[PDB]
Design a protein around this ligand. Sequence first.
Ligand SMILES: Cc1cc2nc3c(=O)[nH]c(=O)nc-3n(C[C@H](O)[C@H](O)[C@H](O)COP(=O)(O)O)c2cc1C
Ligand SMILES: Cc1cc(Nc2ccc(C(F)(F)F)cc2)n2ncnc2n1
Ligand SMILES: O=C(O)c1cc(=O)[nH]c(=O)[nH]1
Length: 376
Amino acid sequence: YNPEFFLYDIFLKFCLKYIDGEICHDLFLLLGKYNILPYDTSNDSIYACTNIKHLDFINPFGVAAGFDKNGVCIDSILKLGFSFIEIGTITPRGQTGNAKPRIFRDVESRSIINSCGFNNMGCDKVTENLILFRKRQEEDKLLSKHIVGVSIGKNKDTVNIVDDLKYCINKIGRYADYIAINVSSPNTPGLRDNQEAGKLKNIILSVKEEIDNLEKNNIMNDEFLWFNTTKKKPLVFVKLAPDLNQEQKKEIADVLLETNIDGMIISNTTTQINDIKSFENKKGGVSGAKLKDISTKFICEMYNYTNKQIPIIASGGIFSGLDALEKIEAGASVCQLYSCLVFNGMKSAVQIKRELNHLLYQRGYYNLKEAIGRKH
Ligand SMILES: Cc1cc2nc3c(=O)[nH]c(=O)nc-3n(C[C@H](O)[C@H](O)[C@H](O)COP(=O)(O)O)c2cc1C
Ligand SMILES: Cc1cc(Nc2ccc(C(F)(F)F)cc2)n2ncnc2n1
Ligand SMILES: O=C(O)c1cc(=O)[nH]c(=O)[nH]1
């Protein structure tokens, strides 16, 4: 460990006590931007590698979407010891999002509620940011093999979703290792942009198509077209809300198999939790420990319904190595953390990786890839 991490966690716990949540987030994004945040320079355990198709993760931990919506702070967040980051959700046109304050924490239950409503600087500006990250990456030893995914969304104003995605893909696809389609947020009407199997099916196919076109259109060899990490075309993921009945779930599984989607992110925030007293007057989706059991259960179901064919990215409610293993044995290949960072601070990646490494050894597993879906 380090004093650096120690000093910052005191600082962060202080901010947690006094300051508004969104103000804290921005301050830490700002420290990152300025590169005063601490680095995890440790070698990751080779027995904790993971992959989704031919996309390779130096470790099983990344930061979920909504954390660095505008890609202002990628180098620093990655250097906290994460293998990947999912920037966005982005929109073609920048939006203010809903009225502030729109992030509320509950320390006792280690949980968050939000109604940001896709605030972001918009596709063009964010693409400029990612471009600059990619150039920084070519000369930053700590960033090599690190993965940046991009989460893409419809504008609140907009009538048609596909058009919005196509635009995003056209602008930012060249710089992405994967694309995350989310139709799972709370906070855009209504309540969840539709994932109607026919709708979703239509959505997924349009996305792959746009990506394919970029490959066709460009005259360059892949080494100079894909200005990303993998040097190949961005994979396609879809992020699902956990607020669906068992039938809606089975119908979605078919669609993912039908379209041969590269992976699924399970899951987004939920609107089905009331136990939080602080949150009673509040609007939006809930994150953190209260989501943990719900989202795990959801991982299991979709793992079964897709016949284990389709790779899973786990979110959220994961704070410990134990929480991580529970997601992995349910059928998840990689894990994403949001809430843990707010709760546990700068050290989350370092701590969780150690915790998982120890736990993998004490359960007799040889490597991480052996534990994926081992509850069946
Ligand atoms: C403040 C806030 C903003 C979020 N913004 C997005 C977003 O822009 N796109 C997205 O797909 N998920 C977003 N999420 C959902 C997270 O990516 C994640 O799936 C969820 O928090 C569950 O993980 P956790 O329990 O570790 O927090 C957001 C969550 C919160 C807390
Ligand atoms: C205290 C706090 C912090 C914060 N986010 C935050 C940002 C960055 C990092 C860093 F990457 F630095 F770890 C850690 C935490 N939020 N977000 C909503 N409420 C928050 N309250
Ligand atoms: O931008 C938001 O408000 C938001 C998006 C999302 O996908 N999930 C979430 O909880 N909030």
